[PDB]
Amino acid sequence: TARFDLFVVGSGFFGLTIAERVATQLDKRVLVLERRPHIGGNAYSEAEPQTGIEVHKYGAHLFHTSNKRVWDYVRQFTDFTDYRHRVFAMHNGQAYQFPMGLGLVSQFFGKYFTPEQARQLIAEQAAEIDTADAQNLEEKAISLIGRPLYEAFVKGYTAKQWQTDPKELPAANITRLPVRYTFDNRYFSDTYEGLPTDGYTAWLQNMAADHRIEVRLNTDWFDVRGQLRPGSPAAPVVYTGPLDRYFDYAEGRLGWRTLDFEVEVLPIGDFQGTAVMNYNDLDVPYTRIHEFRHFHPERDYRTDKTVIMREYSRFAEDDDEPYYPINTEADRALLATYRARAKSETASSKVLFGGRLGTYQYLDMHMAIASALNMYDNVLAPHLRDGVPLL
Amino acid sequence: TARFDLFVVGSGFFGLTIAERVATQLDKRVLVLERRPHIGGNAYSEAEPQTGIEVHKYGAHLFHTSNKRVWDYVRQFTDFTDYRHRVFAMHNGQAYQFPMGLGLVSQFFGKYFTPEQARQLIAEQAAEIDTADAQNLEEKAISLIGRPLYEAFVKGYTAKQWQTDPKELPAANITRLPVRYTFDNRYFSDTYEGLPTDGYTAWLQNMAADHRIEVRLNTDWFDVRGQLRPGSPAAPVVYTGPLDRYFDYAEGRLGWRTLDFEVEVLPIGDFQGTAVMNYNDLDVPYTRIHEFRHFHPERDYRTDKTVIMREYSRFAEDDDEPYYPINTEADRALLATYRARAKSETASSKVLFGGRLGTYQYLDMHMAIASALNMYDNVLAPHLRDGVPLL
Ligand SMILES: Cc1cc2nc3c(=O)[nH]c(=O)nc-3n(C[C@H](O)[C@H](O)[C@H](O)COP(=O)(O)OP(=O)(O)OC[C@H]3O[C@@H](n4cnc5c(N)ncnc54)[C@H](O)[C@@H]3O)c2cc1C
Ligand SMILES: Cc1cc2nc3c(=O)[nH]c(=O)nc-3n(C[C@H](O)[C@H](O)[C@H](O)COP(=O)(O)OP(=O)(O)OC[C@H]3O[C@@H](n4cnc5c(N)ncnc54)[C@H](O)[C@@H]3O)c2cc1C
Ligand SMILES: O=c1ccn([C@@H]2O[C@H](COP(=O)(O)OP(=O)(O)O[C@H]3O[C@H](CO)[C@H](O)[C@H](O)[C@H]3O)[C@@H](O)[C@H]2O)c(=O)[nH]1
Ligand SMILES: O=c1ccn([C@@H]2O[C@H](COP(=O)(O)OP(=O)(O)O[C@H]3O[C@H](CO)[C@H](O)[C@H](O)[C@H]3O)[C@@H](O)[C@H]2O)c(=O)[nH]1
C-alpha cells in the first residue's frame, strides 16, 4: 500500500500533462511538487487589478501548434480564441512589419518588391553563406534574410537577448521565425493558434483538477524527497527543474538566460496599438514591450488605462529562474555529461527528465506538452501498467 | 390549384434567401427566374482550369457580418474558413498598410506614431471639417483620416471607381472602411468573417437545392411574366433586378457603376504576395488587383502558376450589368420617384422589391441576406401564411 504511484517535480505544462495523463488514463495517484507559490510555471497569468486585463507574469505566452493530437488534448481543459499573433519591430524610430516578408522588405528598402523581386534581392544579400551550411545563428540568419536585414533586425536584438556572440549561438534559434516572401505577417506558421479564453491559470487548474492529483505549492523536491520516496518506493519521479541543479552543478553550471519584467499601468487607453513591439536598436535597454489588452481584442477593457510590460534579458544567476538555454559549444558538451548522468539516475532511482529546464531545450508550450505525451506513451504508461523498464 | 406559390426574379443572395425560406419554412413552391446562365449573381465563382483556384468571376467577394442570426443562417449551406481579409495600398511605387491605422500612418509619414500621437496628427489634418457635419464623401473622408491621407489614398482611387466628384458622392461610401488608431489592418470590423470552404457556387447551390424550388436559368422575367402569373395569380413576386429597368426607365435612368475584369494566369507562383492590392495612383487604369490563391492559404496550389484579376471601373450602360449605385443628389431624387412607383406595384400587382439592384442600395452579401430575412419575416411570411397584406 504505497501513498503515491508517481512523483512529479514541477507544475509546468510538462509536469501537469504527465500528472493528468497518469491520473486519468491509468487511474493512479500523482503527487505534484511545486517550488513556486503557484502552478503553471512561467505560463502562470494574473488579472491586473485596475483594468482586469490578464497579465502573463513571466513573459507573454502565445499558444500555437500543427500537432492535432496536442490541439485536441489541450482543448479538453480550455477553449481558444481566434487570436493570431503578430509582431512589429521598432527600428530608427519607425515601426516595421515583421518577420521576414514583403512588408518588412518594402518598408526597409523604400519601395514595393514583388515576391520574385524580393527573392532576387535577398539572394544577393545572402551571398557569403548558404542555408545548407550555416551552423550558428549569424550564418543562418544572413542566409535567410540577407545581411542588411540581419544588421538592423537581428544583430542588435540578439545582442540584448543573449549577450553572446551570434557565431556561438545555435542556428535553431533564428529558424523559430518564419521566412516568407508574401505579406503574411503572422509570427507563427502553425495550423492551430489562439489564447486561452478564460486565461492560462484556469487552463492550468483544469489539468491538475483531478482528485487523484495532489499539488503541494511552496515545496522543493530536494528538501522532501528523502521522506516522500520511502512512503512510496516503487513510484517513479518526473523532474522538470534545471538539469544542472539536480546534480548540484557537479560538472559545471549550464549557460542560461533569465528575464526581468517591468509591469506598468498607464493612464492612457493604448500605448503602442499592438500586442508585442520588438525593440531591435541598442539605444534601448529592453528587448520588447507587451501590451496585454491587444492579446484579447474580443474582450472589452476600459479605454482610460492600459497595462504594458517591458522585457529585460540578462545572464541567469544562482537565485534566478532560468528562462532560455543558450546551448553554445561548451554548453552542449556540458549537457552531454548530464544526459549520461540523467540516464544513470533513471536506471538507478527511476528518475525521468523532461521539460524546458529538465532537458536544457528551447521548448515552446506545445513542444513541451507533445514531449510529455511522448514520455507518457513510450515510457511511463508501459512502466506503471505493464512493468516495462524505464530504459 | 396554382402552379407556384411564389415568383422570385433573380437568383442572387437576396433571391435565394427568399426562395429558401419560403420553400422550407412555409412548405410552398417557389419559381426562381434567372436572366443569367448561372445562379448566385455576382457571387458566382469558378475554378480556373490550369490551377484549380476558385475565381470570383464578377468581383472578389469576402463574407463578413456581426449579425449572429445571419451567421447561423448562412452556415446551414456552407462552412467558412478562418480567412481574415486584409488589403494593401499601392502608392508611388510603395506598398502601404491599409486601411486607416498606425501601419498606414507610420509608413506615410516616415516615423512611428503612438496611438495618442496619431490621433493628434490626424486631428490637425482633419481641421476644416468635422464628422458631425460632412454630408459627402470628400468631407467625411478628410474628417476621418485627414487631408494628406485623403489625397494619396482616397482621391485618386475614388476618381477611378466613380468618375464622379467626391462632393456629390455619399458619405456612407467611405465609412465602409474602418478608421483605427492601432496596427489592426483587418479590412472589416465584423464579429464573423470567412470564405466558403467549398466555394461560393456550392454555397449558392445548397440554398436553391430544395425540390420545392425551381430555378430557370437564361430566363428573363419580363418576357415570361404575362404567361407565368396567370398560371398562379395569387403568387406574389420578388424582384431583385434594376429598379429603374422594371419601369423601363420611365422617369429616367439611375446612376450606376459597372466593372470589367481581366483574368490572367501567370507563369509565376506569386504575383503580389497578397489577396487584394489597391492601386490608388492615376498612372494606372485599374483600381485594384486580386490574387485568388491568397484567398485560400489553407488550400495548397501549384507554385509555378497563379491567377490574378485586374479590376476596371466605368459608367454602366444599357447592356451592362450594374454593380454599384452612385446615389448622387439627382440619383436619390430619381430613386424617390421609383420608390413611390414600387410602392404602387406592391399594392396593385403584389410585387416586392429587394436586393442591391432592386432597392438601388450599396448592399454587401450579409446586408442583402439580412434584408431578405427581414422581408420574409415581416412581409412575405405573414402574407403567404396568414393572408396579411403586403403593405
Ligand atoms: C518570455 C517567454 C515567452 C514564451 N512565449 C511562448 C509562446 O508564445 N508560445 C509557446 O508555445 N511557448 C512560449 N514560451 C515557452 C513556454 O513558457 C514553455 O514551453 C513552458 O514553460 C513549458 O513548460 P515546461 O514545464 O517544459 O517548463 P516550465 O513550465 O518553466 O516548468 C517548470 C516548473 O518546474 C518547477 N520547478 C523547477 N525546479 C523545481 C524544484 N526543484 N522543485 C519543485 N518545482 C520545481 C518550476 O517552479 C516551474 O514551475 C515562452 C517562454 C518565455 C520565457
Ligand atoms: C466587385 C464586388 C465585390 C464585392 N465584395 C463583397 C464582399 O467582399 N463582401 C460582401 O459582403 N459583399 C460584397 N459585394 C457585394 C455583393 O456582391 C452583393 O451584396 C450581392 O450580389 C447580393 O445579392 P443581391 O441579390 O442583393 O444582388 P445580385 O446578387 O447582383 O443579385 C441580382 C440577380 O438578379 C438577376 N436579375 C436581374 N434582373 C433580372 C431579370 N430581369 N430577370 C431575371 N433575373 C434578373 C441577376 O442575374 C442577378 O443574378 C461585392 C460586390 C462587388 C460588385
Ligand atoms: O526581432 C527579432 C526577433 C527574433 N530575433 C532572434 O530570434 C530568436 C528567437 O526569437 P523569438 O521570437 O522566438 O524570441 P522569444 O523566444 O523570446 O519569443 C517568445 O516570445 C514571443 C512573443 O512575441 C513568441 O510568442 C515566442 O513564441 C516566444 O518564444 C531570438 O533569440 C533572437 O535571437 C531577433 O534577432 N530579432
Ligand atoms: O484604397 C481605397 C479604398 C476605398 N476607397 C473608397 O471607399 C469606398 C469603398 O471602398 P470599398 O473597399 O468598399 O470598395 P468596394 O465596394 O469595391 O469593395 C469591395 O471589394 C473589397 C475587396 O477587397 C471588399 O470585400 C468590399 O467588401 C467590397 O464591397 C470606395 O468607393 C472608395 O471611394 C478609397 O478611396 N481608396
mmCIF file of N, CA, C and O in Angstrom, chain B residues 163-205:
data_model
loop_
_atom_site.group_PDB
_atom_site.id
_atom_site.type_symbol
_atom_site.label_atom_id
_atom_site.label_comp_id
_atom_site.label_asym_id
_atom_site.label_seq_id
_atom_site.Cartn_x
_atom_site.Cartn_y
_atom_site.Cartn_z
ATOM 1 N N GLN B 163 -15.579 58.117 -61.076
ATOM 2 C CA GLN B 163 -15.514 59.171 -62.091
ATOM 3 C C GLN B 163 -16.569 60.234 -61.803
ATOM 4 O O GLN B 163 -17.126 60.846 -62.714
ATOM 5 N N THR B 164 -16.833 60.437 -60.517
ATOM 6 C CA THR B 164 -17.816 61.405 -60.052
ATOM 7 C C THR B 164 -17.201 62.222 -58.925
ATOM 8 O O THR B 164 -16.501 61.676 -58.070
ATOM 9 N N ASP B 165 -17.448 63.529 -58.934
ATOM 10 C CA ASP B 165 -16.886 64.425 -57.929
ATOM 11 C C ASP B 165 -17.287 63.988 -56.523
ATOM 12 O O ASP B 165 -18.472 63.808 -56.240
ATOM 13 N N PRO B 166 -16.292 63.814 -55.641
ATOM 14 C CA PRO B 166 -16.475 63.292 -54.280
ATOM 15 C C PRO B 166 -17.421 64.129 -53.420
ATOM 16 O O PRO B 166 -17.911 63.637 -52.405
ATOM 17 N N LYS B 167 -17.674 65.372 -53.821
ATOM 18 C CA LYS B 167 -18.624 66.217 -53.108
ATOM 19 C C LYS B 167 -20.060 65.855 -53.481
ATOM 20 O O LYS B 167 -21.009 66.294 -52.833
ATOM 21 N N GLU B 168 -20.208 65.054 -54.532
ATOM 22 C CA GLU B 168 -21.521 64.584 -54.964
ATOM 23 C C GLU B 168 -21.755 63.137 -54.543
ATOM 24 O O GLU B 168 -22.869 62.623 -54.643
ATOM 25 N N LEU B 169 -20.696 62.486 -54.074
ATOM 26 C CA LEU B 169 -20.775 61.097 -53.640
ATOM 27 C C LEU B 169 -21.169 60.998 -52.169
ATOM 28 O O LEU B 169 -20.786 61.846 -51.365
ATOM 29 N N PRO B 170 -21.945 59.961 -51.816
ATOM 30 C CA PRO B 170 -22.412 59.753 -50.441
ATOM 31 C C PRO B 170 -21.269 59.574 -49.447
ATOM 32 O O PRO B 170 -20.199 59.086 -49.814
ATOM 33 N N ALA B 171 -21.502 59.966 -48.199
ATOM 34 C CA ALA B 171 -20.502 59.825 -47.149
ATOM 35 C C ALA B 171 -20.477 58.399 -46.611
ATOM 36 O O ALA B 171 -19.521 57.989 -45.952
ATOM 37 N N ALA B 172 -21.534 57.646 -46.899
ATOM 38 C CA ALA B 172 -21.651 56.271 -46.427
ATOM 39 C C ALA B 172 -20.698 55.344 -47.172
ATOM 40 O O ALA B 172 -20.433 54.226 -46.729
ATOM 41 N N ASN B 173 -20.187 55.815 -48.304
ATOM 42 C CA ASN B 173 -19.273 55.025 -49.120
ATOM 43 C C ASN B 173 -17.904 54.852 -48.472
ATOM 44 O O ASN B 173 -17.325 53.767 -48.511
ATOM 45 N N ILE B 174 -17.394 55.921 -47.869
ATOM 46 C CA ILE B 174 -16.060 55.898 -47.278
ATOM 47 C C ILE B 174 -16.080 55.300 -45.868
ATOM 48 O O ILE B 174 -15.063 54.797 -45.385
ATOM 49 N N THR B 175 -17.242 55.331 -45.221
ATOM 50 C CA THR B 175 -17.371 54.801 -43.866
ATOM 51 C C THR B 175 -17.490 53.280 -43.856
ATOM 52 O O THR B 175 -17.650 52.669 -42.799
ATOM 53 N N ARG B 176 -17.418 52.675 -45.037
ATOM 54 C CA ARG B 176 -17.347 51.225 -45.148
ATOM 55 C C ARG B 176 -15.980 50.744 -44.674
ATOM 56 O O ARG B 176 -15.822 49.601 -44.247
ATOM 57 N N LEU B 177 -14.995 51.635 -44.754
ATOM 58 C CA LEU B 177 -13.639 51.338 -44.308
ATOM 59 C C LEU B 177 -13.460 51.716 -42.842
ATOM 60 O O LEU B 177 -13.804 52.826 -42.437
ATOM 61 N N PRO B 178 -12.923 50.785 -42.040
ATOM 62 C CA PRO B 178 -12.663 51.032 -40.619
ATOM 63 C C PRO B 178 -11.610 52.113 -40.397
ATOM 64 O O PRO B 178 -10.565 52.100 -41.047
ATOM 65 N N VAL B 179 -11.893 53.041 -39.489
ATOM 66 C CA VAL B 179 -10.912 54.039 -39.085
ATOM 67 C C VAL B 179 -10.349 53.667 -37.719
ATOM 68 O O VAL B 179 -11.059 53.704 -36.714
ATOM 69 N N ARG B 180 -9.073 53.297 -37.688
ATOM 70 C CA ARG B 180 -8.449 52.839 -36.453
ATOM 71 C C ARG B 180 -7.193 53.629 -36.108
ATOM 72 O O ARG B 180 -6.633 54.332 -36.949
ATOM 73 N N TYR B 181 -6.757 53.499 -34.860
ATOM 74 C CA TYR B 181 -5.507 54.100 -34.416
ATOM 75 C C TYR B 181 -4.626 53.039 -33.767
ATOM 76 O O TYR B 181 -3.867 53.318 -32.838
ATOM 77 N N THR B 182 -4.749 51.814 -34.268
ATOM 78 C CA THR B 182 -3.909 50.702 -33.843
ATOM 79 C C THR B 182 -3.189 50.120 -35.054
ATOM 80 O O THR B 182 -3.148 50.741 -36.115
ATOM 81 N N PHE B 183 -2.625 48.928 -34.895
ATOM 82 C CA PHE B 183 -1.963 48.251 -36.004
ATOM 83 C C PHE B 183 -2.874 47.198 -36.624
ATOM 84 O O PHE B 183 -2.439 46.392 -37.447
ATOM 85 N N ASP B 184 -4.140 47.212 -36.222
ATOM 86 C CA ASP B 184 -5.138 46.312 -36.786
ATOM 87 C C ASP B 184 -5.415 46.692 -38.236
ATOM 88 O O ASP B 184 -6.018 47.732 -38.508
ATOM 89 N N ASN B 185 -4.972 45.850 -39.163
ATOM 90 C CA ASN B 185 -5.171 46.119 -40.583
ATOM 91 C C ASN B 185 -6.211 45.196 -41.209
ATOM 92 O O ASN B 185 -6.184 44.944 -42.414
ATOM 93 N N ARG B 186 -7.126 44.692 -40.387
ATOM 94 C CA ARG B 186 -8.257 43.927 -40.896
ATOM 95 C C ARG B 186 -9.192 44.870 -41.640
ATOM 96 O O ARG B 186 -9.626 45.885 -41.095
ATOM 97 N N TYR B 187 -9.496 44.533 -42.889
ATOM 98 C CA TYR B 187 -10.252 45.429 -43.754
ATOM 99 C C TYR B 187 -11.714 45.543 -43.335
ATOM 100 O O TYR B 187 -12.420 46.456 -43.762
ATOM 101 N N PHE B 188 -12.164 44.613 -42.500
ATOM 102 C CA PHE B 188 -13.522 44.656 -41.976
ATOM 103 C C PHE B 188 -13.509 44.654 -40.453
ATOM 104 O O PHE B 188 -12.566 44.164 -39.833
ATOM 105 N N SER B 189 -14.560 45.208 -39.856
ATOM 106 C CA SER B 189 -14.691 45.232 -38.406
ATOM 107 C C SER B 189 -15.945 44.488 -37.966
ATOM 108 O O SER B 189 -16.774 45.028 -37.235
ATOM 109 N N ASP B 190 -16.081 43.247 -38.422
ATOM 110 C CA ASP B 190 -17.225 42.420 -38.057
ATOM 111 C C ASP B 190 -16.812 41.263 -37.155
ATOM 112 O O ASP B 190 -15.656 40.839 -37.163
ATOM 113 N N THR B 191 -17.766 40.759 -36.382
ATOM 114 C CA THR B 191 -17.519 39.646 -35.475
ATOM 115 C C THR B 191 -17.156 38.378 -36.239
ATOM 116 O O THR B 191 -16.190 37.694 -35.904
ATOM 117 N N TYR B 192 -17.934 38.075 -37.272
ATOM 118 C CA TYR B 192 -17.738 36.856 -38.046
ATOM 119 C C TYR B 192 -17.227 37.168 -39.449
ATOM 120 O O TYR B 192 -17.681 38.116 -40.089
ATOM 121 N N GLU B 193 -16.282 36.362 -39.920
ATOM 122 C CA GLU B 193 -15.666 36.580 -41.222
ATOM 123 C C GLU B 193 -15.030 35.296 -41.748
ATOM 124 O O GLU B 193 -14.478 34.508 -40.981
ATOM 125 N N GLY B 194 -15.114 35.090 -43.058
ATOM 126 C CA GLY B 194 -14.509 33.929 -43.679
ATOM 127 C C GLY B 194 -14.956 33.718 -45.111
ATOM 128 O O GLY B 194 -15.828 34.426 -45.615
ATOM 129 N N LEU B 195 -14.350 32.736 -45.769
ATOM 130 C CA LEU B 195 -14.715 32.378 -47.132
ATOM 131 C C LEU B 195 -15.375 31.007 -47.160
ATOM 132 O O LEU B 195 -15.037 30.142 -46.352
ATOM 133 N N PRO B 196 -16.326 30.806 -48.086
ATOM 134 C CA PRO B 196 -16.962 29.493 -48.238
ATOM 135 C C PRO B 196 -15.926 28.412 -48.521
ATOM 136 O O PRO B 196 -15.207 28.495 -49.517
ATOM 137 N N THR B 197 -15.856 27.420 -47.638
ATOM 138 C CA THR B 197 -14.833 26.380 -47.697
ATOM 139 C C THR B 197 -14.818 25.646 -49.036
ATOM 140 O O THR B 197 -13.754 25.323 -49.565
ATOM 141 N N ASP B 198 -16.000 25.393 -49.583
ATOM 142 C CA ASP B 198 -16.116 24.654 -50.835
ATOM 143 C C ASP B 198 -16.557 25.554 -51.986
ATOM 144 O O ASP B 198 -17.164 25.090 -52.949
ATOM 145 N N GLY B 199 -16.248 26.843 -51.879
ATOM 146 C CA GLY B 199 -16.566 27.790 -52.932
ATOM 147 C C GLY B 199 -17.951 28.396 -52.809
ATOM 148 O O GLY B 199 -18.818 27.855 -52.124
ATOM 149 N N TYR B 200 -18.160 29.524 -53.483
ATOM 150 C CA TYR B 200 -19.436 30.229 -53.426
ATOM 151 C C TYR B 200 -20.546 29.482 -54.154
ATOM 152 O O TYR B 200 -21.688 29.459 -53.697
ATOM 153 N N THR B 201 -20.208 28.874 -55.288
ATOM 154 C CA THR B 201 -21.188 28.159 -56.100
ATOM 155 C C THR B 201 -21.851 27.026 -55.316
ATOM 156 O O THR B 201 -23.072 26.877 -55.346
ATOM 157 N N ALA B 202 -21.043 26.242 -54.610
ATOM 158 C CA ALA B 202 -21.557 25.154 -53.782
ATOM 159 C C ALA B 202 -22.488 25.691 -52.700
ATOM 160 O O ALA B 202 -23.524 25.096 -52.402
ATOM 161 N N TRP B 203 -22.101 26.822 -52.118
ATOM 162 C CA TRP B 203 -22.916 27.523 -51.132
ATOM 163 C C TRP B 203 -24.259 27.925 -51.738
ATOM 164 O O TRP B 203 -25.317 27.643 -51.173
ATOM 165 N N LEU B 204 -24.206 28.575 -52.893
ATOM 166 C CA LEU B 204 -25.406 29.062 -53.563
ATOM 167 C C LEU B 204 -26.309 27.922 -54.026
ATOM 168 O O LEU B 204 -27.535 28.047 -54.015
ATOM 169 N N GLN B 205 -25.699 26.813 -54.430
ATOM 170 C CA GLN B 205 -26.452 25.652 -54.893
ATOM 171 C C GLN B 205 -27.230 24.995 -53.761
ATOM 172 O O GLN B 205 -28.337 24.499 -53.965
#
